[PDB]
């Protein structure tokens, strides 16, 4: 069906972000506009970064 949504992550990095420097983690499922999975991290310093799925540190986070 018709999707008015595009892929948000123009850039992506595997950089580990420690828990205490994060405000929000949002997982954006595949399809619905973007064919790949998106993980948007809102840091406390106000910078917003994208981490790719199946990356060493976020892979264990998917369990819960």
């Amino acid at each position, epitope marked *: 069906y018709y999707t008015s949504l595009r892929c948000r992550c123009v850039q992506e990095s595997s950089v*580990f972000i*420690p*828990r*205490r420097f*994060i405000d929000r983690i*949002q997982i954006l499922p595949r399809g619905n506009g973007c064919p790949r999975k998106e993980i948007i991290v809102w840091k*406390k310093n106000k910078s917003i970064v994208c981490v790719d799925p199946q990356a060493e540190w976020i892979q264990r986070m998917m369990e819960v």
Partner: antibody
Amino acid sequence: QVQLVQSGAEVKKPGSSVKVSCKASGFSSYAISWVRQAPGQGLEWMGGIIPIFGTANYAQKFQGRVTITADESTSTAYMELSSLRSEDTAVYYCAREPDYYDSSGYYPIDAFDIWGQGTTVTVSS
Amino acid sequence: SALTQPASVSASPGQSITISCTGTSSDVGAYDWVSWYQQHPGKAPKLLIFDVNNRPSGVSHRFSGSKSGNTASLTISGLQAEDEADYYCASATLLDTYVFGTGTKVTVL
């Protein structure tokens, strides 16, 4: 309503190593820190562990002595304090750094919501 | 080092009191990651405030938190006898650690 149960009060010699356990009631272990409390004194953060992020960090004055481990199968966090001395006589607490999770996302909390009962450590003297 | 708080505060009942917590740019002045704790003698601490002003469920709204620069504060409105306790502020640091305040003994006369 989840609570943290720590190991009983131990009496050890100077130079020895004390391992204090901290179990979470449920099913899996979360972010756990360790806070020392000397008699009549203030609270002192020694270190912590994030089993979810696979990281453990300690305070400069406790670095090289204290060892924090977490077993996700038995949901137990450990506090290993090597080369004990007189000033180490304190009440040792384990505390959880809570995490919030919903449809909008994962929100970590940089605070200590639930605490353990406390493990009194007395050194000889 | 540690977060600076007065050793003790004395006040009459039903009177609001503010407890200061002075840190540095690497902790209190970095982000809103500042917490407050009530500790009754011999008992494990109880989280009163998380973030700067956020109270968890079950905590009275008489306890309110604030922050401006390197200084954080805890206001206890309509002070009761049961409020008689020790109060610690805490803050996470840029070193990926936590730092506790010296502690404030509150007394009701």
